[PDB]
Design a protein around this ligand. Structure first.
Ligand SMILES: *[C@@H]1O[C@H](CO)[C@@H](O[C@@H]2O[C@H](CO)[C@@H](O)[C@H](O)[C@H]2NC(C)=O)[C@H](O)[C@H]1NC(C)=O
Ligand SMILES: *[C@@H]1O[C@H](CO)[C@@H](O[C@@H]2O[C@H](CO)[C@@H](O)[C@H](O)[C@H]2NC(C)=O)[C@H](O)[C@H]1NC(C)=O
Ligand SMILES: *[C@@H]1O[C@H](CO)[C@@H](O[C@@H]2O[C@H](CO)[C@@H](O)[C@H](O)[C@H]2NC(C)=O)[C@H](O)[C@H]1NC(C)=O
Ligand SMILES: *[C@@H]1O[C@H](CO)[C@@H](O[C@@H]2O[C@H](CO)[C@@H](O)[C@H](O)[C@H]2NC(C)=O)[C@H](O)[C@H]1NC(C)=O
Ligand SMILES: *[C@@H]1O[C@H](CO)[C@@H](O[C@@H]2O[C@H](CO)[C@@H](O)[C@H](O)[C@H]2NC(C)=O)[C@H](O)[C@H]1NC(C)=O
Ligand SMILES: *[C@@H]1O[C@H](CO)[C@@H](O[C@@H]2O[C@H](CO)[C@@H](O)[C@H](O)[C@H]2NC(C)=O)[C@H](O)[C@H]1NC(C)=O
Ligand SMILES: *[C@@H]1O[C@H](CO)[C@@H](O[C@@H]2O[C@H](CO)[C@@H](O)[C@H](O)[C@H]2NC(C)=O)[C@H](O)[C@H]1NC(C)=O
Ligand SMILES: *[C@@H]1O[C@H](CO)[C@@H](O)[C@H](O)[C@H]1NC(C)=O
Ligand SMILES: *[C@@H]1O[C@H](CO)[C@@H](O)[C@H](O)[C@H]1NC(C)=O
Ligand SMILES: *[C@@H]1O[C@H](CO)[C@@H](O)[C@H](O)[C@H]1NC(C)=O
Ligand SMILES: *[C@@H]1O[C@H](CO)[C@@H](O)[C@H](O)[C@H]1NC(C)=O
Ligand SMILES: *[C@@H]1O[C@H](CO)[C@@H](O)[C@H](O)[C@H]1NC(C)=O
Ligand SMILES: *[C@@H]1O[C@H](CO)[C@@H](O)[C@H](O)[C@H]1NC(C)=O
Ligand SMILES: *[C@@H]1O[C@H](CO)[C@@H](O)[C@H](O)[C@H]1NC(C)=O
Ligand SMILES: *[C@@H]1O[C@H](CO)[C@@H](O)[C@H](O)[C@H]1NC(C)=O
Lengths: 592, 327, 184, 48
């Protein structure tokens, strides 16, 4: 078994001709299956790209009469390219120099353009043929471009026909013979029958009834609902303040009602340190933030490693302490140009002495003459009686370890309470009664939204059930409560007479009253076991062949078809009872 | 006197992916590494489910001739009206079976949408892949089987269990059974009215004691329900992860860091399913022993007269009558 | 054997692949995941083997009871040793099991008779010793219940108890009394 | 009683040894390993 991008079985491919008596621009969705039926070498290559007009980069794979040419350049392709392609080819990064069934598969993953292929002899006139043949790896090109469209390159003066299909992520069950070749496959998501084949891990199914999987619905739309925020967050009086605080009397600032679009700092501010706890830096753009605070101070360069959870040292013991469970980011940058003076800058201060370590987010500003030993000080500052604070000497000619650094600590909460910061992301309309992917204040999921009678108190945003999953939400725009429901529900079973006998099957939907069915067909029959589709109902009563349930059984009878009936319990005979009448046996039987 | 026996239990099936991942595609791609375990669990559950139908078949479907009781009820003064089927109720059940069925208390997607979900326990189960399968024989078929057994015993004695039913007057059969406990026939024939009156009064006492008992049959229902609800409740365990909610982890964390948390949750939920399946196996073995005992009692107390002490009641056994009860 | 290809949340399911490309301190965590998974697999196997062994043990106890009561004797409990009145059984060995051949007696061809509980001869009530009273239509005989072998009602064949005023369906007939001819 | 000396892939099988020498955020992962192992032992006992 393997899960990958395959062409689904029995799909619907597009067909193109070159018949005297077609080279359009096509999409390249997730990879292409390309088949070609030829006798005279008409199909000569392809061009892959996005715009194909020299503003972006394109890939040319061509077979000219003598060579195979693979180029990645900025081409001005012709509107109608052929052989008997382009005009410009300026900045080139990569360069390299019906009787036939030429099958190719094209993929584009992580900067690699992957090609598989196989050639087959055929003898036909039209229509893509039947059969099975696995393609083998051909080449893997490191091009590093964004392909979205493609166009076929043909030749001019001849009979040719080419077919295009699109790949999807599927699970397949492949079969390897004793020589190592793939001779057969099962598409595990085509049919319920195929699903039982996939589960039993065999190509043969015996007669019976099998549970397959609950009925699943895929979402159609995606929606985003963030609050109405217009202002940008104050990155300019946080990261670009003229004077910072000393680490012992560190500063704390509230932040609210602003969009957190930090891409404005890309040109503004180069950071030597930027580390986030409890969140991935790649999710910041999709989240909304609760109780945001910013802490600011200035330290020596050597001491920056101490602004982290569970650290020791004088900064982390007497000046500034982080919690063990911290959510937020630490940001630090060198500030020698701003905070160093040629004589020496003594404005910035720290605590060198404290009886005990600080608690998390506790500030100490007390200037009490520290008593080292015995013999109390009476606040006079002498032997074993020291001024508690000390200053940093910042000069332009310090070593990098001794230079000043500006530090900002951002503290926030995620996905529990109503939020007001909410990074950059555009909101859509609210759509109801459909299975839809959704994002509410950064919380993502899938399901169906309905109007709710629940009344939330003003300080709450989400509602959770016994299993702890979120089932209600206040809309951040209209302030209305909405219920969330899963869109996958209901049991399914498949009835087969045996794959040896036939491929015809019946399907039972256990939670449908006959529509949440895979196909309607005909012969829709309702039982207390559910809705049965694909079986003819008869008024007889036989012995049970295949049990369906609630007294209903099924069989494969005579033209052959699946029939569903009510099982008979046996023959009915009444005893001839009277009050003066007996029955005596006259012979016997010996039975083994 | 009355004896109560459990014969079958609830049949259940699990959608493994529905329970472990919900509708998360990433969790399903991660879970593809554990498919053998889900297939193994489902194999064990399907074995249990077919065994339940085999139990019911072995207890109730011994004889394949569906006898009918005679229209003329001349049984020497014995009145079996309380255990014979009432031909006017929708279900063709006897009066006592109707009383018994009222003493044990045992769904479309649109029916539970929104509020109703997570409040009603059955829908909470069904949104997490836990389904209950219906039995093969309905209540009406089992009632038909019991009525056939009763008609056979009161019209033909014990002959219908060895071959073809041979009719005999009911008093002469009673005299035969008196011979089988060591009492001569004339005792029955002389005391026939007293014996019939005592039998009728005793049946009345049974009836009046039921409309006022079935704990052995209610605890099976309670145990199955409690196990399914415990599985639904165990979905709020972190198992040492940041949260127990997949959607909360998938936002705020990228795939390489979300994978370790998802892996913890997957291991925990597979362990929960495994524990459920093991305890279901042990319970099914106990129900199977009980159903074998019920089949032996049906053969030896209803289809014959038993001489082994205390197998068919307290005292010298004369005859037995079966009635169907839920499970 | 098939469950050895599970990663259990490790980089690979192959130990040799992990041991190359990783040093002991980083290989230990992956190996630990694999060890936990494979111990769980062995545990599941052993538990299901225990439950299956209990079922086989119940079956073997039943087989021993059948051997004692059907082969080493004649059983009167209904349907334990076949369908019908049990006569005898023969065991045969089978791979992992036993097969029993039960020889039983089955009543074959039935005929209808009118019957009666007692006979009233001279103000006395006569009951069968070990049979049943039947009539072919015109005449009265006594027979045995499981095979039809009619006989003349005599005093060495019935027993008397009481008069004829209490038994519900008594009939009038003569009882031979096979001594009177000899005394004469 | 004897199965209480298994590490289950942790630094030690003794809780007091882990609680000294390690802070709560780093002690939690080791304690979690021990908890999972000891719950599995109790489960096996109850099944048998
Ligand atoms: C097919 O393409 C190849 C490569 O673009 C052509 O080969 C080049 O031809 C030019 C013109 O003579 C030479 O200057 C290059 O050195 C050749 N490159 C090679 C040989 O690698 C080839 O001529 C083309 N064939 C046709 C029929 O046009
Ligand atoms: C892509 O091509 C353009 C166009 O030639 C390049 O831009 C010119 O490159 C030359 C080569 O040094 C310079 O003299 C010009 O000043 C550039 N600008 C213009 C407007 O002509 C560009 O460098 C190429 N890009 C890459 C990545 O190779
Ligand atoms: C918070 O303040 C209390 C009281 O000032 C501190 O506790 C005292 O600590 C001194 C030694 O530093 C002891 O002599 C006192 O007996 C303590 N009193 C009480 C009531 O606990 C405590 O250390 C301070 N906490 C921090 C983190 O500075
Ligand atoms: C009792 O039954 C046996 C068979 O079970 C009868 O024997 C058969 O008789 C027919 C003709 O009457 C023959 O064609 C068969 O070959 C006989 N079978 C055997 C095994 O011998 C027997 O006749 C019956 N007796 C009575 C009195 O009905
Ligand atoms: C057999 O028993 C039934 C029920 O005990 C008797 O039917 C009842 O008869 C009384 C009159 O004595 C009525 O008041 C009840 O309503 C009857 N109940 C039902 C359910 O019919 C019946 O009479 C008894 N005897 C016979 C010959 O049937
Ligand atoms: C009932 O059995 C009696 C007694 O065997 C039958 O009467 C006998 O009939 C045979 C045949 O005609 C005679 O040879 C005997 O002499 C008769 N015996 C007596 C005592 O009369 C009688 O035929 C049978 N009745 C029916 C209806 O079958
Ligand atoms: C059996 O015989 C007794 C007496 O031998 C019959 O009882 C007498 O029957 C006649 C006519 O039916 C009555 O007039 C007498 O009063 C009855 N009692 C006596 C004589 O004590 C009895 O009826 C017979 N049974 C039948 C013929 O079925
Ligand atoms: C496998 O290889 C052998 C030896 O070359 C060959 O004879 C056979 O046809 C091949 N195919 C199969 C299916 O065995
Ligand atoms: C980035 O900043 C530099 C220095 O202020 C400026 O010269 C440049 O134009 C800026 N780039 C843009 C357009 O953001
Ligand atoms: C920071 O403030 C100074 C003061 O004039 C300004 O020149 C600089 O461009 C600012 N940087 C920003 C806003 O990123
Ligand atoms: C936000 O926008 C919506 C729609 O534009 C509007 O109904 C609502 O009043 C606005 N304000 C708040 C606080 O939701
Ligand atoms: C299906 O719905 C119909 C229409 O309401 C109803 O009569 C019937 O009871 C339902 N079927 C079952 C099996 O409950
Ligand atoms: C089955 O019986 C019903 C009602 O008796 C009747 O309407 C239906 O047509 C019958 N079906 C067949 C195939 O005869
Ligand atoms: C006995 O008599 C009843 C009454 O009609 C009849 O139906 C039955 O077939 C008879 N049995 C035999 C064996 O003749
Ligand atoms: C048998 O029933 C008839 C009426 O059908 C009755 O006259 C006769 O007395 C009854 N016999 C017995 C023994 O009850």
């Amino acid at each position: 078994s393997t899960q990958d991008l395959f062409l689904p079985f029995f799909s619907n491919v597009t067909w193109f001709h070159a018949i005297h008596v077609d080279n359009p621009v096509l999409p390249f969705n997730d990879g292409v299956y390309f088949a070609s039926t030829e006798k005279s070498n008409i199909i000569r290559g392809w061009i892959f790209g996005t715009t194909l007009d020299s503003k972006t980069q394109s890939l040319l794979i061509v077979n000219n009469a003598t060579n195979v040419v693979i180029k990645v350049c900025e081409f001005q392709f012709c509107n109608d390219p052929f052989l008997g392609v382009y005009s410009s080819a300026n900045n080139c990064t990569f360069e390299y120099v019906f009787k036939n069934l030429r099958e190719f598969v094209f993929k584009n993953i992580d900067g690699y353009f992957k090609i598989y292929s196989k050639h087959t002899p055929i003898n036909l006139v039209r229509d893509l043929p039947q059969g099975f043949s696995a393609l083998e790896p051909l080449v893997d090109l490191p091009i590093g471009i964004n392909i979205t469209r493609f166009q076929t390159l043909l030749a001019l003066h001849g009979a040719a026909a080419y077919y295009v299909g699109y790949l999807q992520p599927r699970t397949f069950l492949l079969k390897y013979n004793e020589n190592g070749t793939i001779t057969d496959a099962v598409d595990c998501a085509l049919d319920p029958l195929s699903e039982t084949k996939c589960t039993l891990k065999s190509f043969t199914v015996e007669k019976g009834i099998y549970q397959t999987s609950n009925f699943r619905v895929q979402p159609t739309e995606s929606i985003v609902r963030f609050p109405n925020i217009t202002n940008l967050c104050p990155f300019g009086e946080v990261f670009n303040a003229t004077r910072f605080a000393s680490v012992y009397a560190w500063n704390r600032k509230r932040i609210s009602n602003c969009v957190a679009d930090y891409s404005v700092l890309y040109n503004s501010t180069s950071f030597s340190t930027f580390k986030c706890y409890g969140v991935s830096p790649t999710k910041l753009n999709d989240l909304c933030f609760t109780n945001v605070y910013a802490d600011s101070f200035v330290i020596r360069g050597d001491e920056v490693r101490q602004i982290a959870p569970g650290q020791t040292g004088k900064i982390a013991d007497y000046n500034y302490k982080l919690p063990d469970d911290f959510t937020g980011c630490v940001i630090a940058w060198n500030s020698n140009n701003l905070d160093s003076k040629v004589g020496g800058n003594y404005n910035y201060l720290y605590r060198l002495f404290r009886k005990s370590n600080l608690k998390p987010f506790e500030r100490d500003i007390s200037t009490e003459i520290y008593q080292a030993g015995s013999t109390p000080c009476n606040g006079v500052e002498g032997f074993n009686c020291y001024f508690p604070l000390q200053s940093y000497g910042f000069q332009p000619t310090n070593g990098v370890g001794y230079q000043p650094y500006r530090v900002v600590v951002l503290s926030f909460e995620l996905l529990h309470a109503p939020a007001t910061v909410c990074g950059p992301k555009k909101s859509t309309n609210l759509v109801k009664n459909k299975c839809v992917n959704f994002n509410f204040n950064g919380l993502t999921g899938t399901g169906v939204l309905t109007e709710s009678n629940k009344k939330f108190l003003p300080f709450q945003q989400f509602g959770r059930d016994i299993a702890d999953t979120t089932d209600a939400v206040r809309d951040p725009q209209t302030l209305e409560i909405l219920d969330i429901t899963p869109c996958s529900f209901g049991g399914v079973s498949v009835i087969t007479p045996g794959t040896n006998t036939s491929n015809q099957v019946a399907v039972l939907y256990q939670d449908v009253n006959c529509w949440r069915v895979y196909s309607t067909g005909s012969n829709v029959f309702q039982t207390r076991a559910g809705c049965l589709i694909g079986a003819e109902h008869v008024n007889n009563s036989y012995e049970c062949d295949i049990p369906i349930g609630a007294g209903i059984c099924a069989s494969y009878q005579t033209s052959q078809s699946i029939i569903a009936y009510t099982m008979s319990l046996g023959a009915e005979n009444s005893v001839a009872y009277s009050n003066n009448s007996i029955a005596i046996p006259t012979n016997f039987t010996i039975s083994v | 006197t009355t004896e109560i026996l459990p014969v079958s239990m609830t049949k259940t099936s699990v959608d493994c992916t529905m329970y472990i991942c919900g509708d998360s595609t990433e969790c399903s791609n991660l879970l593809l590494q554990y498919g053998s375990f889900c297939t193994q669990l489902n194999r064990a559950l399907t074995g249990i489910a077919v065994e339940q139908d085999k139990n019911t078949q072995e207890v109730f479907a011994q004889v394949k001739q569906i006898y009918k009781t005679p229209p003329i009820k001349d049984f020497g003064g014995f009145n079996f009206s309380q255990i014979l089927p009432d031909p006017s109720k929708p279900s063709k059940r006897s009066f006592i079976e109707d009383l018994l069925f009222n003493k044990v208390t045992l769904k479309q997607y649109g029916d539970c949408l929104g509020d109703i979900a997570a409040r009603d326990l059955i829908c909470a189960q069904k949104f997490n892949g836990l389904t209950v399968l219906p039995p093969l024989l309905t209540d009406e078929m089992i009632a038909q089987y019991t009525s056939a057994l009763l008609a056979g015993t009161i019209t033909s004695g014990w002959t219908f269990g060895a071959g073809a039913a041979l009719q005999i007057p009911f008093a002469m059969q009673m005299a035969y059974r008196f011979n089988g406990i060591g009492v001569t026939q004339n005792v029955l024939y002389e005391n026939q009215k007293l014996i019939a009156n005592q039998f009728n009064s005793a049946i009345g006492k049974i009836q009046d004691s039921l409309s006022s008992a079935l704990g052995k049959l209610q605890d099976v229902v309670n145990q199955n329900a409690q196990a399914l609800n415990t599985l639904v409740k165990q979905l709020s365990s972190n198992f040492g992860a940041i949260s127990s909610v997949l959607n909360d982890i998938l936002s705020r964390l990228d795939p390489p860091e979300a994978e370790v948390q998802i892996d913890r949750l997957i291991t925990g939920r597979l362990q929960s399913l495994q524990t459920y399946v093991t305890q279901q196996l042990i319970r099914a073995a106990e129900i199977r022993a009980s159903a074998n005992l019920a089949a032996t009692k049906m053969s030896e107390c209803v289809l014959g007269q038993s001489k082994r002490v205390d197998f068919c009641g307290k005292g010298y056994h004369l005859m037995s009558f079966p009635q169907s009860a839920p499970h | 054997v098939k469950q050895l290809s599970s990663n259990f949340g490790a980089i690979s399911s192959v130990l040799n692949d992990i041991l190359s490309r990783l040093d002991p301190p980083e290989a230990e965590v992956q190996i630990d995941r694999l060890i936990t998974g494979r111990l769980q697999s062995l545990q599941t196997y052993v538990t299901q083997q225990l439950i299956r062994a209990a079922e086989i043990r119940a079956s073997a106890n039943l087989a021993a009871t059948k051997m004692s009561e059907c082969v080493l004797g004649q059983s009167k409990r209904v349907d334990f040793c076949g369908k019908g009145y049990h006569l005898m059984s023969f065991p045969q060995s089978a791979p992992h099991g036993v097969v029993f051949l039960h020889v039983t007696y089955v009543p074959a061809q039935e005929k209808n008779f009118t019957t009666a509980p007692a006979i009233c001869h001279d103000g006395k009530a006569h009951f069968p010793r070990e049979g049943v009273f039947v009539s072919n239509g015109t005449h009265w005989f006594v027979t045995q219940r499981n095979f039809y072998e009619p006989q003349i009602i005599t005093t060495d064949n019935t027993f008397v108890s009481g008069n004829c005023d209490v038994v519900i369906g008594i009939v009038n007939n003569t009882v031979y009394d096979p001594l009177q001819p000899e005394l004469d």
